[PDB]
């Protein structure tokens, strides 16, 4: 059988930050397209 999932980790959270007016918390491969 397959166990229920364990040890939850939220590793990447990307959002647009309107104060700075740019995406933040980007994946690295998105970064070298957008930054």
């Amino acid at each position: 059988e397959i166990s229920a999932p364990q040890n939850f980790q939220h590793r990447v959270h990307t959002s647009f930050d309107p104060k700075e007016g740019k995406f933040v918390g980007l994946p690295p491969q998105w970064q070298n397209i957008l930054d």
Binding site: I2, P5, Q6, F8, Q9
Partner: protein
């Protein structure tokens, strides 16, 4: 080793709630659209632990150029639609399967129907009826899965958790197969 599982599908389809409900057994109390989120859990199959990497993508078209940058070395896709959103069902054929095929031609995917608890809801059956439409049945979903040409069709409710673990258990088996 690590299983890479990528979740795609139209906005409002319920991809974030699907993932948070399964990984945490909590239902998000707010709607907040996704740009990109990466979560990890550990699962054990037959005594062997695996990290399941879960890629939560944006269903909004604004991210068409950016979203797929996350598709390299995907082991399995979940292609999602809401059983009470016919337009989301159409886009499976028109947008989503074509997209993941193009980027990952030899990668398996599952067709996932979400929000099944809303099929028998009078006031979502009403909203659909005001524009002369109705929920998607499993019979219809399953034909599309056969034709299009998925591993299989599974459905669930993030809210009630009916069928939810099964979706990911089949995703895991598809990736390891």
């Amino acid at each position: 080793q690590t299983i890479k599982c990528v979740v795609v599908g139209d906005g409002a389809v319920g991809k974030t709630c699907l993932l948070i409900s399964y990984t945490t057994n909590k239902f998000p109390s707010e709607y907040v659209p996704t740009v990109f989120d990466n979560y990890a859990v550990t699962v054990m199959i037959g005594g062997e632990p695996y990290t399941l990497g879960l890629f939560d993508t944006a269903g909004q078209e604004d991210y068409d150029r950016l979203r797929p940058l996350s598709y390299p070395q995907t082991d399995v896709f979940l292609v999602c639609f809401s059983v009470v959103s016919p337009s989301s069902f159409e886009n499976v054929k028109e947008k989503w399967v074509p997209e993941i095929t193009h980027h990952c031609p030899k990668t398996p995917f599952l067709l996932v129907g979400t929000q099944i608890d809303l099929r028998d809801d009078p006031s979502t059956i009403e909203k659909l009826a005001k524009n002369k439409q109705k929920p998607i049945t499993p019979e219809t979903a399953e034909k599309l899965a056969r034709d299009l040409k998925a591993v299989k069709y599974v459905e669930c409710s993030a809210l009630t958790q009916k069928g939810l673990k099964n979706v990911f258990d089949e995703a895991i088996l598809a990736a390891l197969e």
